[PDB]
Amino acid sequence: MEMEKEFEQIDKSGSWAAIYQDIRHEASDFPSRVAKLPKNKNRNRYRDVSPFDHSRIKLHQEDNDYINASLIKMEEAQRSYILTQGPLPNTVGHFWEMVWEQKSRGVVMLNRVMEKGSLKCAQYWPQKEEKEMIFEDTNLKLTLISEDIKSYYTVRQLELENLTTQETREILHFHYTTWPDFGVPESPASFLNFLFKVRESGSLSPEHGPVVVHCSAGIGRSGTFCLADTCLLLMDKRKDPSSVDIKKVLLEMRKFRMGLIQTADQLRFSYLAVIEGAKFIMGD
Ligand SMILES: O=C(O)c1ccc(-c2ccccc2)s1
Numbered sequence: 001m002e003m004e005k006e007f008e009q010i011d012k013s014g015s016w017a018a019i020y021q022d023i024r025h026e027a028s029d030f031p032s033r034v035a036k037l038p039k040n041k042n043r044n045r046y047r048d049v050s051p052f053d054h055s056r057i058k059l060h061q062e063d064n065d066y067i068n069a070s071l072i073k074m075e076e077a078q079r080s081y082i083l084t085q086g087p088l089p090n091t092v093g094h095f096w097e098m099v100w101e102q103k104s105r106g107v108v109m110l111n112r113v114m115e116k117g118s119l120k121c122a123q124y125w126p127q128k129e130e131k132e133m134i135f136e137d138t139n140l141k142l143t144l145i146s147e148d149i150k151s152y153y154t155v156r157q158l159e160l161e162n163l164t165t166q167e168t169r170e171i172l173h174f175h176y177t178t179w180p181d182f183g184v185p186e187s188p189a190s191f192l193n194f195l196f197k198v199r200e201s202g203s204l205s206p207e208h209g210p211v212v213v214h215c216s217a218g219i220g221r222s223g224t225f226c227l228a229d230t231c232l233l234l235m236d237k238r239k240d241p242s243s244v245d246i247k248k249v250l251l252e253m254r255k256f257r258m259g260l261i262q263t264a265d266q267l268r269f270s271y272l273a274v275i276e277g278a279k280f281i282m283g284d
Pocket residue numbers: 029030031032033
């Protein structure tokens with residue numbers, strides 16, 4: 001079926017939970033043996049969210065190459081994403097090592113450091129220009145260059161220096177700051193505006209390594225971001241845009257990381273975002 005009318009049909013019939021459970025039942029199951037090794041227990045935030053062995057990002061280190069991060073490679077859309085958990089106190093250096101080694105231009109953050117009165121990820125970037133951060137375990141230096149605070153999101157320019165080689169690179173940090181503590185946003189307009197700002201920066205384009213996107217577990221809000229982006233790109237590429245099937249795209253992405261889209265409300269929000277986005281792209 002098309003998307004916008006499938007949408008009103010699910011709303012009128014109140015069957016979002018049944019649609020979502022079908023997705024969960026059909027999703028891929030692949031091994032995640034490296035994630036479960038005892039030496040990696042303090043490298044995982046949640047025991048039930050792990051990268052598959054076949055798609056996990058490897059650190060260029062011979063001691064321990066493990067990070068909780070996955071490469072999502074969308075062949076028809078010609079887009080790739082790295083989805084990862086929010087960094088932990090003992091993985092902030094690994095996180096920036098990955099950004100460096102994978103040649104990423106941008107980092108997309110969809111959570112606040114504290115939500116619901118608890119810490120959802122480490123404070124992993126510097127908050128003042130004159131107070132830079134040094135990660136001694138991976139030999140990197142990180143400096144805040146500029147910050148632009150808007151009503152729904154903040155963009156930061158960061159300088160990452162590899163202290164071994166003295167090479168430097170400019171990294172863009174895109175921080176969506178207004179996702180509610182509970183539920184999903186009422187309108188997708190600010191989320192879509194944010195996606196378009198990430199696109200306009202070059203961070204999603206083939207001349208760079210894959211964008212790094214995270215929330216707290218790296219599967220819920222993060223899944224919504226890449227699912228909406230890929231669906232909108234396919235609608236622009238195909239002769240028949242009404243052939244794009246958001247449930248089939250989501251099952252393809254779940255071949256590369258488990259659990260993408262955590263609730264039926266997140267699934268409904270993803271449909272809403274793609275539907276509204278397809279009108280702005282042209283023109284209705
Ligand atoms: O950790 C493991 O060894 C596994 C996890 C999942 C496995 C599996 C088995 C049959 C079909 C599809 C997956 S095996």
